[PDB]
């Protein structure tokens, strides 16, 4: 189970937290009003985080502390809603029987028990807040039969714990108060219990080669990264512009665009503009067929199974049928594969032929195109 490992890691955390030789010291404060022992101040825990974790941002370490303290590993002594606030307020760890890692699950009758007990320990005030008084009202209205032994065991517990010493009753009641804060929290702060229903159950090359490839593929667009270093400062997000994308709309490229075409004809064909200009050169050079074929293959790989046969036979009769004008050119195993598969229209029909013609084009056309006068004149401006 996933979150179990999460709680285990944070258990590692607090275990290092209350370390014997190191750790925060749980002090006993003395006040003009009283003498409170076994607490400490949130600035202490903040300092402890920063020391032993090297969390550079005070804010970052504070957020880590925030969610830890909202998982019941320490609480503010005078508040319901778990939040670590860096100041002089008094905290406390929790008990190994009341972590949240122990698969615990309270239920409505037990909430009624804790309500009766708190409301009946003191009888000086409605020692509670409005949400908890509201919860008890509902529990009354719906638990009409079963109340009595609730009250019974409540005051029984009260005697069984008050019989032990006065500081003992205080610390135990504080702990077994906060642990029900965390498992039924105030309306505002998020619960930290729930989980998502999903979890509710060979040729190789040297790394240096990959290093060069990765660095270089970074660099060749490194000057295109619109997060790191963008030459077009036009940011429709940041600087309230629209012109950048709108220039991206127009068929006229950017000089960026034309320099970017020059890397690989694959990227060119990705570009519609690149498709158009490459096709123009192929036409004016009387060499506009293989690109026509490959575009044909790709435009065939887009339609559903309703048209696959309607196109495959037709495309054969137009290009791959010997005697048609468009003369795609195959070797032995290529044309063999084509003839065998052409009976059956397939989603991967012309793989080897496409490989053949594709390596042809990648090896020949793109080079001369980048070397071409039209390319140079368009990249100049």
């Amino acid at each position: 189970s996933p979150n179990m490992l999460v709680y285990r890691k944070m258990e590692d955390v607090i275990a290092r937290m209350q370390d014997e030789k190191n750790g925060i010291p749980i002090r006993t404060v003395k006040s003009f009003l009283s003498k409170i022992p076994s607490v400490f101040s949130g600035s202490d825990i903040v300092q402890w985080l920063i020391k032993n974790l090297t969390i550079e941002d005070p804010v970052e370490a504070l957020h880590l502390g925030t969610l830890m303290a909202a998982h019941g590993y320490f609480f503010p002594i005078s508040d319901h809603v778990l939040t670590l606030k860096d100041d002089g307020t008094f905290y406390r760890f929790q008990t190994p029987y009341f972590w949240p890692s122990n698969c615990w699950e309270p239920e409505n009758t037990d909430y009624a028990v804790y309500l009766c007990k708190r409301t009946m320990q003191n009888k000086a005030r409605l020692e509670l807040a409005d949400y908890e008084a509201e919860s008890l009202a509902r529990l009354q209205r719906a638990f009409a039969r079963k109340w009595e032994f609730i009250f019974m065991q409540a005051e029984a517990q009260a005697k069984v714990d008050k019989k032990r010493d006065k500081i003992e009753r205080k610390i135990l009641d504080s702990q077994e108060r906060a642990f029900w804060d965390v498992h039924r929290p105030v309306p505002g702060c998020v619960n930290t219990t729930e989980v998502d229903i999903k979890k509710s159950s060979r040729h190789r090359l040297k790394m240096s080669k990959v290093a060069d490839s990765l660095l270089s593929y970074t660099e060749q667009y490194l000057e295109y990264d619109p997060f790191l270093l963008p030459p077009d400062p036009s940011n429709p997000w940041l600087s309230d512009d629209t012109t950048f994308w709108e220039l991206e709309a127009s068929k006229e490229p950017s000089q960026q665009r034309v320099k970017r075409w020059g890397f690989g004809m694959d990227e060119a064909l990705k570009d519609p503009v690149g498709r158009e200009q490459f096709l123009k050169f192929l036409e004016s050079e009387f060499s506009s067929e293989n690109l026509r074929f490959w575009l044909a293959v790709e435009d065939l790989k887009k339609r559903p199974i309703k048209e696959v046969p309607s196109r495959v036979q037709e495309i054969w009769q137009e290009f791959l049928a010997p005697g048609a004008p468009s003369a795609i050119n195959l070797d032995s195993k290529s044309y063999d594969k084509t003839t065998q598969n052409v009976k059956e229209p397939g989603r991967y029909t012309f793989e080897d032929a496409q490989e053949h013609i594709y390596k042809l084009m990648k090896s020949d056309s793109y080079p001369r195109f980048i070397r071409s006068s039209a390319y140079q004149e368009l990249l100049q401006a």
Binding site: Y97, F149, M152, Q153, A156, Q157, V160, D161
Partner: peptide, 20 residues
Amino acid sequence: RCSKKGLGRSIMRRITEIPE
């Protein structure tokens, strides 16, 4: 009532001791 009460008391006591 007395039997149930005594049982509940001793049981909660044994529980709180097992927790300690």
